Ligand binder design. Structure first.
Ligand SMILES: O=C(CN1C[C@H](NC(=O)c2ccc(Cl)s2)C[C@H]1C(=O)NCC1CC1)Nc1ccc(-n2ccccc2=O)cc1F
Ligand code: NA
Lengths: 232, 52
């Protein structure tokens, strides 16, 4: 996360972190329930063996932080690096998460209500332990960042790659705030009356916080049914 | 003739227009209140709520 601020206690409880073998987080995830984490399909190709940590906010102090092995990985069959289209996956954990301080699931919204009510808000919230500068280092602290929804037309113009209807853009033209490397797979959530609903998955960007470029997110409304089926 | 486009049909969470009226509903882990508008958590860690 470039810009934004550290999540305060209890504020980003659906945040999960994908940790490789050398125990370093490389992607984020979103807690959807006790057994399932939402993440980006493209994260899967940055580790053959990885686990999921929850409850963390500072990777420099080690209570409540907890690691979970992944039992089953459900990658979208239509994902591909060529396009980054369909950039989504669900993980089943081998042992269930116990919800507690800093560990709770985000809500899956109903699709049409989310399109007409969540996606039409001004901003959503993205969070992660990813790099705090494009070339910087990952943050030991969980951070969050308010990101404006950006109009699909503008993002298309702004972009050097094809933005599909399974993607949306959020962020800033020039302001130095964005998600970044290491945030991929993590939550984009939209608050509606004190409740936070999953609206996006950090997916990709040309750099991080670049001028004239935005954050690109998997559009969760496009896959609410797919997640449902993946979780059953 | 009621709409979700005005104060979300007075719903706490999901709103749909049904037979010229609004019907509210809630995410899993919540039960719709008797008043038909509010969403009442059924456990202590309902989705989408910060653990404050
Ligand atoms: O592959 C990267 C790598 N990057 C991704 C990362 N930024 C992000 O992941 C995000 C930014 C904002 C959001 Cl949201 S996610 C920064 C930078 C990096 O890792 N530099 C490492 C190098 C040392 C500098 N970006 C990327 C991925 C996919 C695509 N892409 C999109 C559509 C079609 C094909 C395609 O390749 C374009 C890209 F520019
Ligand atoms: Na930008």
């Amino acid at each position: 996360i470039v810009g934004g601020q550290e999540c305060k206690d209890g504020e980003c409880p659906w945040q999960a972190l994908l940790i490789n073998e050398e125990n370093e987080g490389f992607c984020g995830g979103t807690i959807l329930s006790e057994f399932y984490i939402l993440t980006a399909a493209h994260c899967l190709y940055q580790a053959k063996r990885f686990k999921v940590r929850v409850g963390d906010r500072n990777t420099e102090q080690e209570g409540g932080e907890a690691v979970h092995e992944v039992e089953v990985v459900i990658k979208h069959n239509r994902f591909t690096k060529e396009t980054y289209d369909f950039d989504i996956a669900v993980l089943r954990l081998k042992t269930p998460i116990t919800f507690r301080m800093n560990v709770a699931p985000a809500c899956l919204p109903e699709r049409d209500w989310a399109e007409s009510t969540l996606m039409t808000q001004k901003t959503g919230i993205v969070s992660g332990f990813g790099r705090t500068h494009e070339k910087g280092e990952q943050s030991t602290r969980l951070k969050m960042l308010e990101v404006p929804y950006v109009d699909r037309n503008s993002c298309k113009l702004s972009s050097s790659f094809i933005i599909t209807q399974n993607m949306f853009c959020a962020g800033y033209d020039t302001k130095q705030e964005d998600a970044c490397q290491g945030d991929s797979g993590g939550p984009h959530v939209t608050r509606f009356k004190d409740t936070y609903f999953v609206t996006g998955i950090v997916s990709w960007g040309e750099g991080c916080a670049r001028k004239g470029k935005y954050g690109i997110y998997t559009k969760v409304t496009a896959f609410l049914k797919w997640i449902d089926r993946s979780m059953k | 003739r009621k709409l979700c486009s005005l104060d979300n049909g007075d719903c706490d969470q999901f709103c749909h227009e049904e037979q010229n009226s609004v019907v509210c509903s809630c995410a899993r882990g919540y039960t719709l209140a008797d008043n038909g508008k509010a969403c009442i958590p059924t456990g202590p860690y309902p989705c989408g709520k910060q653990t404050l």
